[PDB]
Ligand binder design. Structure first.
Ligand SMILES: C[S@@+](CC[C@H](N)C(=O)[O-])C[C@H]1O[C@@H](n2cnc3c(N)ncnc32)[C@H](O)[C@@H]1O
Ligand SMILES: C[S@@+](CC[C@H](N)C(=O)[O-])C[C@H]1O[C@@H](n2cnc3c(N)ncnc32)[C@H](O)[C@@H]1O
Lengths: 337, 337
């Protein structure tokens, strides 16, 4: 069977969930074979080759109504935290926001910058919880900026601003007590330059908190290993996402210094994408109606839905692999050098 | 059975090699159970607790004739490198010296400092290979200084000096192009202060190369877990040796920045201690004769020999565990911040 044949059946809804999960699990299984080496000597050789390679490098948006139908209350687009099997996505968003506040040592009165803030759930959480904080979200999306500002207005929050910028091009002398990067570093083409830039927005009193999807042992770009992987390039059509190992950022301490380091087991991410998948499925009719005017045809709507749903189904297999002990979430706390 | 009972039988030579190896292997097996955690989340919690704990902290010598009877030609007292099963200890010393020169990027004309240089094998190797290098060994032993200076004289080397100092107390404004630390960091009570001090002896052009015994996954002090471990406190009577994880020094980048990172599989160390054990056994009669005047009695001689021989037997079990994939040697290359 060819890529086109599997892709044809997928877009027509001919692949059942059981087969779909099985196919994507097998693709990730092959990535594990690719990444694990027989000795720690070889593992470190492999890992350092990847780290060295990184140091040499360098219109359409979904309507808010659709995003509200698929994601949780604050439209968090990152791994959440589930205390219980019955923890709801809304509760899991709040729990994850609270976890970031604890680990980033957020205190009332601080200036806070959230880089790649998305729909601003964390920005709004900190602003509401800590009235004397000033909280700045930075996003490259005008729609996202507008969404956050509307929400801040509705919530009577007067301590929020949003910078509309590509972070890689943003120039400022402004510094912040706290810089947060929640599942945004994965999209950075030049990590060393990114960390350098962030350090210039810090004083000696500042802390930097990074949360990123990882594998516990090795790093990889999110891409097809071989011609049998129809999945990776379907989810991310460009070579834009890097999955760092849980320890990869320890080698990016030119300009910042590590203070603490954690991982959150992959079942939390698994439960996050599962919740999004189930909510989308529940609101399927409504989602199709929302997307129709902006996409022009039912076929274009089906394609967008298939893409997001498959992202969740595949994400589930990736992060649930070996009870969350392969792909997971890494977190690190840094000070300036 | 008690500690004293096993220790009594050991000192009397009543424990055969098979039983001795079995007993020490079991002690190290229990250390593995202690160190491995069920999830990477728990592993990192455990590892960071250890790293944080480190950041809060802080007459008799063996005659050269005995050392020559037990160790290889240059009396190297660190893991060596064995290309073949039939590689001799002398060849393995030279191979390891060459490996350090390659990985530390030693070039003719550089100033080189070797911290805790021991009997000076590496100092003498670099001095002979690179005539325009000036090579300084630093050791806390007057006997070692005298040995190195005699060897340099015999070898017609004019580019060697030795500093007699406790490195933790040594104060100087002198800087070096290359600083080498070969299995000495294990003895440092305050690692953060140690790395800070080393950085002050570096310029922007300098490199620092550290080689240390490690476990691939976790860190531990070389000490008894429980009352059943007669071995650890017999080998090192004080709490003076720390076995860092293969990645532990990545968290000590306040003052230096990582450039490269390797491990050497534990079978190389295993073959090193095996070679020392076998050479001591071959030269047993001679060793007893050498040690007798300085120790006063045959019983005191037996005790010293038992200690060193057991060190080798135990070291073999430790480093050969799972074909060298538990305890091994970590190497790191740094520049100044
Ligand atoms: C997976 S999301 C996470 C968003 C948010 N932090 C959260 O937890 O919900 C990654 C975000 O990074 C943003 N992003 C990617 N590249 C960027 C850039 N160069 N400048 C600013 N934002 C960027 C994306 O638009 C996206 O909103
Ligand atoms: C295992 S040996 C390695 C010696 C040598 N680098 C080699 O590879 O053969 C560790 C050395 O560090 C030395 N050492 C320990 N503490 C020291 C200190 N505070 N100052 C200087 N040397 C020290 C010990 O005396 C010992 O020679």
């Amino acid at each position: 069977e060819s890529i086109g044949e599997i892709m044809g059946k997928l877009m027509q809804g001919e692949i059942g969930d059981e087969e779909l999960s099985k196919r994507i699990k097998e693709i990730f299984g092959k990535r594990l074979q690719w990444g694990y080496k027989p000795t720690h000597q070889q593992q470190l050789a492999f890992n350092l080759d990847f780290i060295k390679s990184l140091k040499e490098m360098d219109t359409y948006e979904l309507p808010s109504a659709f995003l509200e139908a698929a994601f949780g209350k604050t439209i968090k687009q990152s791994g959440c935290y589930f205390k219980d099997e019955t923890t709801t996505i809304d509760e899991a968003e709040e729990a994850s926001h609270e976890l970031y506040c604890e680990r980033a040592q957020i205190k009332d009165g601080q200036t806070v910058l959230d880089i790649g803030c998305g729909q601003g759930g964390l920005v709004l959480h900190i602003a509401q919880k800590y009235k004397n904080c000033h909280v700045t979200g930075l996003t490259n999306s005008k729609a996202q900026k507008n969404y956050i500002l509307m929400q801040a207005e509705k919530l009577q929050l007067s301590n929020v601003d949003v910078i509309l910028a590509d972070v890689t091009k943003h120039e400022s002398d402004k510094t912040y007590d706290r810089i947060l990067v929640i599942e945004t570093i994965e999209h950075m083409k030049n990590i060393q330059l990114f960390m350098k830039k962030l350090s210039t927005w810090m004083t000696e009193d500042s802390l930097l908190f990074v949360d990123h999807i990882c594998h516990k042992t090795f790093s990889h770009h999110f891409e097809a290993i071989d011609e049998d992987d129809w999945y990776s390039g379907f989810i991310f059509p460009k070579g834009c996402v890097t999955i760092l190992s849980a320890s990869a950022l320890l080698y990016f301490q030119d300009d910042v210094t590590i203070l603490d380091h954690w991982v959150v087991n992959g079942m939390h991410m698994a439960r996050s994408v599962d919740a999004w998948r189930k909510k989308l499925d529940k609101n399927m009719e409504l989602a199709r109606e929302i997307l129709l005017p902006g996409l022009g045809s039912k076929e274009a709507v089906n394609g967008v839905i298939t893409h997001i749903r498959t992202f969740c189904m595949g994400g589930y297999e990736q992060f649930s692999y070996n009870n969350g002990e392969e792909w997971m979430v890494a977190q690190m706390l840094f000070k300036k050098k």
